[PDB]
C-alpha cells in the first residue's frame, strides 16, 4: 500500500497530546508498526500491531486503527519526545514506509546567553587562528550570527553548528566557529560576535591584549 | 546482547559493486525474517530487500530487482547485501533489521553507501588548422575531449582508418574534477583543400559518441 | 575467447570493506590455480593471494594474511577477493590472473582500490572561560576539537560525571578535508576557583583519548 | 625468494642487444617467469620456465638461467619493446616479483614541429577558453613549456599531457592546454607558446582577430 503520513511535520509544547495519521491506500493487513528515529540514530521501535506497545516504550505513546488511517497518539508529549516517526506497512513481503512525520517541541521564546572564545595560545602557536561564538540554550532555532573584526565584517570564513533541541529544556544551541590565520589574527585588536533574534541584538566582544 | 553490525560501505561510482555485510550476535540469524532499510540523507525509509530464515527465499524492492542480491551465511551468522548497477538514488544510509513479531525489533548503527560525481558525457571542441600552423606540407589538426566523467573515451579518426601520425594524450584531471585530453594527428597541407577529417570520440559510461569534423579555422 | 573480467573497485578508508570479483569465460575456473596480484600506482609488482582448483587451497602473502580473503564461486564461474582491515599500503591496481605452465597465462583489465585521506587524531583546544564571559553567576567553558578524521570523536567531561550543561556540537567539515567540533559546558561563576574541568576526547579511528583541563584565560 | 631484477632501468635504441638480469636470493626451481607491462595495460606473458617462449611472443625475446641470475635476452631491440619488464618466481606457493626494469628506446635527438590552437568559436559561446599547444615527435622526453599573454608570463593555469614514446619513431609527444575565462580571452592580443630545449626555444604565436 502507499502508508500516507499526516502531516509531514508539527510543533507541540511539552504536555500536548499529540496525533500522526497514517493512511494505507488499499489494505486490510492489521499489521502496522510505529518507529522513532531520533536524530543520527537507528529507528526505534515502538508500537507494534498498530496496538500492541512494545517492551521498554513509555506509557504516552498508544497506537489505533481507523480501518485505513492507522493512527499513533502521545498523550503527554514530553520534550525526550522530539524526533521523527514513521509508519510501516508488512503486506506478503511488502514492507512499505510513511513519508515521516518530524516533530520539534515548542517552547516558550528565550534568547540566548552569548560567550565569545578568543584563540588559545596554543593554536596561536600552529599558525590557525579560531574564534568561536556559543548561543546558549535559546529558542527558536533561528538566528543571524555576524563576525566583526576592527568593525570590518567578515564573511565565508565561519562554520556554525547547531545542537539537537534539548531533551530538558527543549532549547537549541549554536556555536559560529571564525576561522583565520596566525598573522591576520596578530594584524586586528576587536573583534566582535553578533546575534539577531527578531528585534533583538547582542554582540560580545574582546580587545587583543586586554586581561 | 541482540547486536547487529554492519559494515562494507564507502563510495562507488555509478555502476561499481559493493557487497554490504550485516553480523549479528545473541541470536541465530537462521531462524528469523532479515531485511534491509535504506534512508537518503534528508529523506525517509525505503525497504531495500529481505529473506527468509531456512528457507532463504530473497524479497526486494522494485526499485533494486535486478541490480541488488541479498544472500546470508549461517556459518558466519551474517546477511549480505551485493549492490551492483548502483545509480544516483542508491546513495543512502543502510540498515540490516531483524523481523520480530509483524515489525523490526533490533537495527544497526548503519552504513553509508555513496555514489560518484555522476557520470558526464564529453565536450568535442575542433583543434582547428591554419596556414600559420602549417608548416611546409604538413599541417596539424585535432579535436579535444574536455569535461567528462567518469573514464575512458575511445577516440578514433575517420572511422579508424586515419592511423598514422594519430595522437591521442592521456587524460588529465582538471581542477573542476572532469576528466579531459585531446586528440590530433598531422595531415599533408594539401590534403586540407579535399580530405574531411572526423574525430570519433565515444564514452561508454555515458553511452555517448561524438564525431566532429575538423575544418579550417575561419572568421 | 579467454577473458577475466574485473569488478567491485572504489574508494575506502582504513578498515572498511570491500569485495573484488573476477568473472571468467572460456574456461572452467574451477580448474585452474587463480591469482591476484597488485601494482601500487606508479610501483612494481606484488603477489596478493591464490586459490587451487578443486581443492580450494588458498595462499596469501604476509601482508594481507589476516585482513583479505579469497574465495571462488563454481556456480557463477567467478573468483573473489574479501578485503578487510584495509590501510593506505593496500592502494593499489588489483588483477586476477590465470596459473599457466608455471607461470600466469591470461590477465584481467585491473580494478583499482583506493584509500581514503588516512587517519587523523584530532587537536584539543581550551575553549577558555573568563571574566568578561561570566554572566552573573553563570560562566562558561569548553575545549575545541579540530582537524580529526574520519569520524566520530567521543566527548565527554570530568570522566563523565558532567552531564547537566554539557552542549557537544555536531561535526562540521572544514575546507582542509578536516572534521571538527566543540563541547562546551556552563559552569557556576564560583566554581572556577575550585572545580576543575577536563574534556575527554576518544578517537577510536586513531585509538587516541585527549584530556585536556580548560583552565582561566592569562597573558 | 627475492627477485632482485638488475637494472632497474635502462635506455637502448632501436636493434641493440638488451639484457635484464634476475636473480633469486637462494633457490632453485628453475620455474621462473618474465613479463612485460606495456603503459597502462596488463602484465604479458613473454616467457616460462626461464627458456621457453610463450605462444605469440617475437623471437627477439630469449630466456636463460645463470643458476641463480635468471637473465631475459632480447637480441634485436624493436621500438614497440618499449616497456616496463618483471621476473617472477614461483616457489611453495611463493609467487615473488622483481623490482621491475624500465625500457626506453633511445634515438637521435630531435626537436618537435609546435603548432598553437586557438580556442574554438564554440568553447567561446560556452565562457572558457582552453589554447592549446603541440609538441610533436620530439627526442628526449623533458621540455620547457611556457605561455605567455600580450608578453605576460602565464603560471598555474595550464595542464600538459604527454604520449607514450612513439611505437614507430621512438619520440614523444606533448600538449599544453591553457585554461582561461572567456571575458579574459577578450581581453588580450597576442598569444604565445616557448618551448625550450636545450639550446634552442622556438614560439608559435597568434593574434585575436588575424585571419
Known amino acids: 500500500i502507499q502508508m500516507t503520513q499526516s502531516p509531514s511535520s508539527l510543533s507541540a509544547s511539552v504536555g500536548d497530546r499529540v496525533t500522526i495519521t497514517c493512511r494505507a491506500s488499499q489494505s486490510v493487513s492489521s499489521a502496522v508498526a510505529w518507529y522513532q528515529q531520533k536524530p543520527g540514530k537507528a529507528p526505534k521501535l515502538?508500537?507494534?500491531?498498530?496496538?500492541?506497545?512494545?517492551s521498554g516504550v513509555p506509557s504516552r505513546f498508544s497506537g489505533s486503527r481507523s480501518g485505513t488511517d492507522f493512527t499513533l497518539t502521545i498523550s503527554s508529549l514530553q520534550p525526550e519526545d522530539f524526533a521523527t516517526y514513521y509508519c510501516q506497512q508488512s503486506s506478503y513481503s511488502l514492507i512499505t514506509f510513511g513519508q515521516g512525520t518530524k516533530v520539534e517541541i515548542k517552547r516558550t521564546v528565550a534568547a540566548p546567553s552569548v560567550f565569545i572564545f578568543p584563540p588559545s595560545d596554543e593554536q596561536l602557536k600552529s599558525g590557525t587562528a579560531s574564534v568561536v561564538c556559543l548561543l546558549n540554550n535559546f529558542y527558536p532555532r533561528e538566528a543571524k550570527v555576524s563576525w566583526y573584526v576592527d568593525n570590518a565584517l567578515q564573511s565565508g570564513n565561519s562554520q556554525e553548528s547547531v545542537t539537537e533541541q534539548d531533551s530538558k529544556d527543549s532549547t537549541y544551541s549554536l556555536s559560529s566557529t571564525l576561522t583565520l590565520s596566525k598573522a591576520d589574527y596578530e594584524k586586528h585588536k576587536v573583534y566582535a560576535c553578533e546575534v539577531t533574534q527578531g528585534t533583538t541584538s547582542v554582540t560580545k566582544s574582546f580587545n587583543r591584549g586586554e586581561c | 546482547e541482540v547486536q547487529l553490525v554492519e559494515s562494507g560501505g564507502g563510495l562507488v561510482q555509478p555502476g561499481g559493486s559493493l557487497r554490504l555485510s550485516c553480523?549479528?550476535?545473541?541470536?541465530?540469524?537462521?531462524?528469523?525474517?532479515?531485511?534491509?532499510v535504506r534512508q537518503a540523507p534528508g529523506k525517509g525509509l525505503e525497504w531495500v530487500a529481505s529473506i527468509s530464515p531456512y528457507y532463504s527465499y530473497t524479497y526486494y524492492a522494485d526499485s533494486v530487482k535486478g541490480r541488488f542480491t541479498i544472500s546470508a551465511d549461517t556459518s558466519k551468522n551474517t546477511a549480505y547485501l551485493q549492490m551492483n548497477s548502483l545509480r544516483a538514488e542508491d546513495t543512502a544510509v543502510?540498515?540490516?533489521?531483524?523481523?520480530?513479531?509483524?515489525?523490526?525489533?533490533?537495527?544497526?548503527?548503519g552504513t553509508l553507501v555513496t555514489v560518484f560525481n555522476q557520470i558526464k558525457g564529453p565536450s568535442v571542441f575542433p583543434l582547428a588548422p591554419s596556414s600559420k600552423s602549417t608548416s611546409g606540407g604538413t599541417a596539424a589538426l585535432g579535436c579535444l575531449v574536455k569535461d567528462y566523467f567518469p573514464g575512458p573515451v575511445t577516440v578514433s579518426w575517420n572511422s579508424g582508418a586515419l592511423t598514422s601520425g594519430v595522437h591521442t594524450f592521456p587524460a588529465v584531471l582538471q581542477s573542476s574534477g572532469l576528466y579531459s585530453l585531446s586528440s590530433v594527428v598531422t595531415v599533408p597541407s594539401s590534403s586540407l583543400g579535399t580530405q574531411t577529417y572526423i574525430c570519433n570520440v565515444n564514452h561508454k559510461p555515458s553511452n555517448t559518441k561524438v564525431d566532429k569534423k575538423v575544418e579550417p579555422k575561419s572568421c | 575467447e579467454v577473458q577475466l573480467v574485473e569488478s567491485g573497485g572504489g574508494l575506502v578508508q582504513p578498515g572498511g570493506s570491500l569485495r573484488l570479483s573476477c568473472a571468467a569465460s572460456?574456461?572452467?575456473?574451477?580448474?585452474?590455480?587463480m591469482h591476484w596480484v597488485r601494482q601500487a600506482p606508479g610501483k612494481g609488482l606484488e603477489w596478493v593471494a591464490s586459490i587451487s582448483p578443486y581443492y580450494s587451497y588458498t595462499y596469501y602473502a604476509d601482508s594481507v594474511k589476516g585482513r583479505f580473503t579469497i574465495s571462488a564461486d563454481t556456480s557463477k564461474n567467478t573468483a573473489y577477493l574479501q578485503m578487510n582491515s584495509l590501510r593506505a599500503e593496500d592502494t593499489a591496481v588489483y588483477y586476477c590472473?590465470?596459473?599457466?605452465?608455471?607461470?600466469?597465462?591470461?590477465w584481467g583489465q585491473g580494478t583499482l582500490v583506493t584509500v581514503f585521506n588516512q587517519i587523523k587524531g584530532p587537536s584539543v583546544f581550551p575553549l577558555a572561560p573568563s571574566s568578561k564571559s561570566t554572566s552573573g553567576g553563570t560562566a562558561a567553558l569548553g575545549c575545541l576539537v579540530k582537524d580529526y578524521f574520519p569520524g566520530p570523536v567521543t566527548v565527554s567531561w570530568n570522566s563523565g560525571a558532567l552531564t547537566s550543561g554539557v552542549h557537544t556540537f555536531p561535526a562540521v567539515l572544514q575546507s582542509s578535508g578536516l572534521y571538527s567540533l566543540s563541547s562546551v559546558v556552563t559552569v557556576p561563576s564560583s566554581s572556577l576557583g575550585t572545580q576543575t574541568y577536563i574534556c575527554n576526547v576518544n578517537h577510536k579511528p586513531s585509538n587516541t583519548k585527549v584530556d585536556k583541563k580548560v583552565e582561566p584565560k592569562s597573558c | 625468494i627475492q627477485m632482485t631484477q638488475s637494472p632497474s632501468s635502462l635506455s637502448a635504441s632501436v636493434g641493440d642487444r638488451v639484457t635484464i638480469t634476475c636473480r633469486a636470493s637462494q633457490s632453485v626451481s628453475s620455474a621462473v617467469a618474465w613479463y612485460q607491462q606495456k603503459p597502462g595495460k596488463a602484465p604479458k606473458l613473454l616467457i616460462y620456465?626461464?627458456?621457453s617462449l610463450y605462444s605469440g611472443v617475437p623471437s627477439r625475446f630469449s630466456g636463460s638461467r645463470s643458476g641463480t641470475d635468471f637473465t631475459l635476452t632480447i637480441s634485436s631491440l624493436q621500438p614497440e619493446d618499449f616497456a616496463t619488464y618483471y621476473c617472477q618466481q614461483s616457489s611453495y606457493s611463493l609467487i615473488t616479483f622483481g623490482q621491475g626494469t624500465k625500457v626506453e628506446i633511445k634515438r637521435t635527438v630531435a626537436a618537435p614541429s609546435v603548432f598553437i590552437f586557438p580556442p574554438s568559436d564554440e568553447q567561446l559561446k560556452s565562457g572558457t577558453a582552453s589554447v592549446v599547444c603541440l609538441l610533436n615527435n620530439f627526442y628526449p622526453r623533458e621540455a620547457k613549456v611556457s605561455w605567455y599573454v600580450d608578453n605576460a608570463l602565464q603560471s598555474g593555469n595550464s595542464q600538459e599531457s604527454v604520449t607514450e614514446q612513439d611505437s614507430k619513431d621512438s619520440t614523444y609527444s606533448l600538449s599544453s592546454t591553457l585554461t582561461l575565462s572567456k571575458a579574459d580571452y577578450e581581453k588580450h592580443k597576442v598569444y604565445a607558446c616557448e618551448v625550450t630545449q636545450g639550446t634552442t626555444s622556438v614560439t608559435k604565436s597568434f593574434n585575436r582577430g588575424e585571419c
Open positions: 590472473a590465470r596459473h599457466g605452465y608455471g607461470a600466469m597465462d591470461y
Open positions: 572460456g574456461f572452467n575456473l574451477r580448474s585452474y590455480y
Open positions: 620456465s626461464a627458456s
